[PDB]
Structures are given as C-alpha cells and as structure tokens.
Amino acid sequence: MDISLLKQVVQSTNKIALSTAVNNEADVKIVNFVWYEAQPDTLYFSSVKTSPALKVYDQNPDIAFITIPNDGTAGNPYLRAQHVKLQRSTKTMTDLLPQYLETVPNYQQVWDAIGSTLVVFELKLTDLFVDAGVGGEKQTLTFN
Amino acid sequence: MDISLLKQVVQSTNKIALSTAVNNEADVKIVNFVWYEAQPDTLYFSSVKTSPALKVYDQNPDIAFITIPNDGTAGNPYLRAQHVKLQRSTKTMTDLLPQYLETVPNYQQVWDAIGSTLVVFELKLTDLFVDAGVGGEKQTLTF
C-alpha cells in the first residue's frame, strides 16, 4: 500500500495529543512519538514507569490521537486516528533512542535524567486520516 | 478572582486539543477557540453544523482539553482542564468573529467559505490549570 502521503506528513511532527476514555473519563496528554517506514501502522512512545498515565496505558485501552506540527512548520499538516490499539512494545528505548535523538529536540538530557525508568508502548493503527495541509493532499489509509 | 495569569497564557494560543469520552470511546481533534475576560469560565469554539462531531457533542460527552502554543512561543505555556461541560451557545459566530480575526491567522477565508454553516459551542470550566511555562507560575483556578 502506498504510504507516500503518510511519509510526507510524519516528517514534520514528533508529537501527538493522545486521548483516552477509560471509565468514560476524557483525558488528553501530549507525548513524543517515533515512527519507522518498515512498520508504517505503528507509532511508538514511552512513559515513566511510576507515572499515573502509564497506569491507564497498561489497561491496553483503545485510544485516539492527532499529531501537532513541529515549530516552524506552517500549512497545518496532521495525522488523526481513533480506535488505536495500545499495548506494551517488544522494542526497548535502546532500540528507539537513535530515532528519538534525531527527531526530538534536547532528548539527550531527558534520556540521561530518567531513561532507565521509561517503558515503551506501541500504538497500532487500523484507519488513519492523513492531511498534508496547505497545498497538499488528503486521504485515509486502512492497515491490515 | 485574579485572572491575570490566565489572560497572559491564553494570549499565546488560539487552539485546543479537544478530547471526548462517550461510551468509553475516545476522540480528539484540534479546534480554534476564543476567550473573553468578561466571561472567564468559558471557551468558545465552532463546528460546521453537518459535522459528525455534533453527534458526539449531543451525547453529553466527558471533555478534557489542553491548549497548543502559537508557533514561536517560548517555554511551553498551556491551559489544561478535565470534566469540562459542553453546551450550545446563544452567541453566534458574528459575535465571535472579531476575536477569531484578531487571533487566528487567515480565518477570513474560512469565514468567507463556510461561515453561515458554523454552530457555536461553549466549554464551561470547573477547575482550570494554568501553566505559564519554564520559570513561570502554575495555578489552578476554580470557577
């Protein structure tokens, strides 16, 4: 399946508003994420193992998200999804760290401070809306 | 109530990640909002009338939001609220348009395209967390 538009948009964001509805309580948090073209249906993020958040996340709820463009990126591009499966990943932060360092400003100091306490989660997509923004195209993708 | 910190933070954002919970299902979308000193417990936003979002809003969802700073804003300020009440407004978009034009780049062209179809909603606050950013004050306002 042709993920070129997804690739166009994901290049200019490194964070999502990640929302939950466990026990019918709305919550939204902004977290950084990383993404790899070989596994295009998956976004990865990490949380501190003592955080109240990681506590909702470990119930493996279905979640919604929307990306936020990097500072300096005009045009309003974004990705948006609901019914996203959420679970702990087999990837570790050691696996993901190069991509974090490449894409998330000042992440080295975060890793150095709290890295050993981070747990990796993955977000598995079914349907995804993709909008390249001003001058660009829009589509939906559905992953198997 | 001293709303000075609120006034300060609210100047550097024009949008929220608006999160809903209905039937244990999550959704989130980023929408523009406007805010007035005279009615400090309320954020206003608008949605075309035929949007499926309205079907969600009609189910009295639980609502949470966080603001997103304007491009170029120093220090990651934000407002954050949970258990927010949504209701239809008696305000129209024509009442709100001045503030939209002041604060939302290029909104005139959105208005010119689809303005007559917009419906105004009010987000009514109980507690609001206000974080002025790095080196800045944090507080919770209770309305």
Q: Which of A19, A22, A65, A129 to mutate to test the interface with B (most CBs of B within 10 A)?
A: A19
Question: Please, which experimental method was used?
Answer: X-ray
| Residues making up chain B, counted from first to last | 143
- Minimal Cβ distance to B64: which of A26, A65, A82: A26
For residue A57 the two structure tokens come to 């996340």
From B119's Cα to the closest Cα of chain A, the distance in A is: 22
Report the sign of the C-alpha dihedral through residues A83, A87, A93, A96, in that order: negative
CB within 8 Å: A28 and B71: no
CB within 8 Å: A26 and B71: no
B23 in reach of chain A (CB within 8 A): yes
Q: Which of B13, B14, B18, B19 to mutate to test the interface with A (most CBs of A within 10 A)?
A: B19
From A138's Cα to the closest Cα of chain B, the distance in A is: 16
Q: How many Cβ atoms sit within 10 Å of the Cβ of residue B98?
A: 10
What's the CATH number where A29 sits? 2.30.110.10
Whole-angstrom CA distances from B67 to A108, A119, B64 are 26, 26, 10
CB within 8 Å: A82 and B22: no
Residues A123/A63, Cβ–Cβ less than 8 Å: yes
Residues A99/A70, Cβ–Cβ less than 8 Å: no
Report the sign of the C-alpha dihedral through residues A55, B19, B126, B87, in that order: negative
A104 in reach of chain B (CB within 8 A): no
Question: Following CA atoms A95, A98, A103, A105 in sequence, which dihedral angle do they give, to the nearest 10 degrees?
Answer: 110
Query: What residues of A are in contact with residue B21 (Cβ under 8 Å)?
Result: 20-21, 24-26
Q: What angle do CA B140, A67, B47 make, to 5 degrees?
A: 75
**Which residues, at least 6 apart from A8, have a Cβ–Cβ distance to it below 8 Å?**
A77, A132, A136
From A11's Cα to the closest Cα of chain B, the distance in A is: 17
Q: From A137, A143, A2, select the one nearest A75 (Cα to Cα).
A: A137
Report the sign of the C-alpha dihedral through residues B44, B48, B53, B55, in that order: positive
Q: Please give the DSSP secondary-structure letter assigned to residue A94.
A: H
B72 in reach of chain A (CB within 8 A): yes
Residues B41/B127, Cβ–Cβ less than 8 Å: no
Total domains present in chain B: 1
B20 in reach of chain A (CB within 8 A): yes
CB within 8 Å: A78 and B30: yes
- Minimal Cβ distance to A27: which of B25, B61, B64: B64
Distance, CA of B129 to CA of B139 (rounded, Å): 6
- Minimal Cβ distance to B82: which of A22, A26, A78: A26
List the domain range (segments joined by +) for residue B100. Answer: 2-143
Instruction: Report CA B119 to chain centroid distance, whole Å.
Output: 14
CB within 8 Å: B27 and A19: yes
Q: From B63, B69, B118, B117, select the one nearest B87 (Cα to Cα).
A: B63
